Design a protein around this motif. Structure first.
Motif, PDB file in Angstrom:
ATOM      1  N   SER A  85     -16.093  20.347  45.255  1.00  0.00           N
ATOM      2  CA  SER A  85     -16.226  21.654  45.238  1.00  0.00           C
ATOM      3  C   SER A  85     -17.825  21.498  44.861  1.00  0.00           C
ATOM      4  O   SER A  85     -18.200  20.740  44.187  1.00  0.00           O
ATOM      5  CB  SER A  85     -15.588  22.488  44.096  1.00  0.00           C
ATOM      6  N   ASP A  89     -20.896  23.308  43.077  1.00  0.00           N
ATOM      7  CA  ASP A  89     -21.383  23.975  41.796  1.00  0.00           C
ATOM      8  C   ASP A  89     -22.448  25.001  42.332  1.00  0.00           C
ATOM      9  O   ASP A  89     -23.543  24.219  42.571  1.00  0.00           O
ATOM     10  CB  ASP A  89     -21.695  22.999  40.698  1.00  0.00           C
ATOM     11  N   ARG A 140     -18.679  18.349  43.113  1.00  0.00           N
ATOM     12  CA  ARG A 140     -17.817  17.701  41.968  1.00  0.00           C
ATOM     13  C   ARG A 140     -16.393  17.665  42.435  1.00  0.00           C
ATOM     14  O   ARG A 140     -16.082  18.383  43.074  1.00  0.00           O
ATOM     15  CB  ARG A 140     -17.948  18.226  40.699  1.00  0.00           C
ATOM     16  N   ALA A 165     -12.605  18.407  42.065  1.00  0.00           N
ATOM     17  CA  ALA A 165     -11.785  19.477  41.378  1.00  0.00           C
ATOM     18  C   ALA A 165     -10.421  19.609  41.800  1.00  0.00           C
ATOM     19  O   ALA A 165      -9.910  18.963  42.796  1.00  0.00           O
ATOM     20  CB  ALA A 165     -12.719  20.943  41.447  1.00  0.00           C
ATOM     21  N   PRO A 217      -9.511  26.549  40.513  1.00  0.00           N
ATOM     22  CA  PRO A 217     -10.047  27.148  39.452  1.00  0.00           C
ATOM     23  C   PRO A 217     -11.423  26.805  39.242  1.00  0.00           C
ATOM     24  O   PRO A 217     -11.690  25.617  39.483  1.00  0.00           O
ATOM     25  CB  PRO A 217      -9.037  26.639  38.437  1.00  0.00           C
ATOM     26  N   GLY A 218     -12.090  27.843  38.724  1.00  0.00           N
ATOM     27  CA  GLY A 218     -13.499  27.793  38.332  1.00  0.00           C
ATOM     28  C   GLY A 218     -14.508  27.980  39.516  1.00  0.00           C
ATOM     29  O   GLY A 218     -15.129  28.991  39.766  1.00  0.00           O
ATOM     30  N   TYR A 219     -14.300  26.926  40.503  1.00  0.00           N
ATOM     31  CA  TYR A 219     -15.058  26.724  41.603  1.00  0.00           C
ATOM     32  C   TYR A 219     -15.041  27.915  42.697  1.00  0.00           C
ATOM     33  O   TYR A 219     -16.064  28.104  43.321  1.00  0.00           O
ATOM     34  CB  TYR A 219     -15.024  25.538  42.026  1.00  0.00           C
ATOM     35  N   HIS A 220     -13.857  28.229  42.994  1.00  0.00           N
ATOM     36  CA  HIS A 220     -13.553  28.865  44.184  1.00  0.00           C
ATOM     37  C   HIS A 220     -14.141  28.578  45.489  1.00  0.00           C
ATOM     38  O   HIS A 220     -14.353  29.109  46.261  1.00  0.00           O
ATOM     39  CB  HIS A 220     -14.063  30.295  43.860  1.00  0.00           C
TER      40      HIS A 220
END
Length: 168
Positions: free
Chosen positions: A55, A57, A64, A66, A153-156
């Motif tokens: 993913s 950022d 990163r 993920a 999750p988080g990154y979408h």
């Protein structure tokens, strides 16, 4: 309407060779059918998964590993879009599938059907994150009546077909 991609979009796994999203999702759906974990929505299905993707950022532009934890299978819309970039990337998505677009120093999200030639989207070039102009967007009518997505999750987003594809 479904925000999703074609079966053959190949997801880069953090810990193995890259794999067609349709394969990842349909296997998860088949297992959840039998163990009672299958979820249903008006136009499709979800099922649990546990896989490692890559993913972006968007604030720091770092890539990163993920985890993705839900697999989505949805009815294909009546029309789909093939998106091609100048840097050589190609992906087939639903018309409302959003892309990260860098425009005048800010990243916003733009539906596939709203993309214009020259809009820069987030890609990989070799091992480097690259903002890559869209070259052409072409509508087609799908032969495959299903489309696919993953939740990250988080990154979408997850890396597939050399593009950081927006996700659930």
């Amino acid at each position: 309407s479904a925000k999703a991609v074609d079966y053959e979009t190949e997801v880069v796994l953090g810990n193995g060779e890259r794999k067609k999203i349709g394969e990842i999702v349909e296997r998860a759906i088949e297992e959840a059918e039998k163990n009672g974990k299958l979820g249903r929505v008006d136009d499709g299905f979800y099922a649990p998964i546990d896989i490692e993707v890559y993913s972006l950022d968007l604030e720091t532009l770092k890539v990163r590993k993920a985890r993705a934890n839900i697999a989505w299978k949805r009815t294909a819309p009546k029309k789909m879009m093939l998106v091609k970039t100048r840097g050589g990337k190609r992906i087939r998505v639903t018309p409302t599938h959003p892309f990260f677009v860098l425009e005048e120093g800010k990243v916003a999200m733009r539906k596939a059907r709203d993309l214009e030639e020259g809009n820069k989207i987030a890609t990989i070039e070799g091992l480097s994150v690259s903002w890559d102009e869209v070259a052409e967007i072409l509508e087609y009518e799908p032969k495959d009546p299903w489309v696919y997505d993953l939740q990250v999750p988080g990154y979408h987003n997850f890396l597939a077909n050399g593009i950081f594809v927006h996700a659930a």
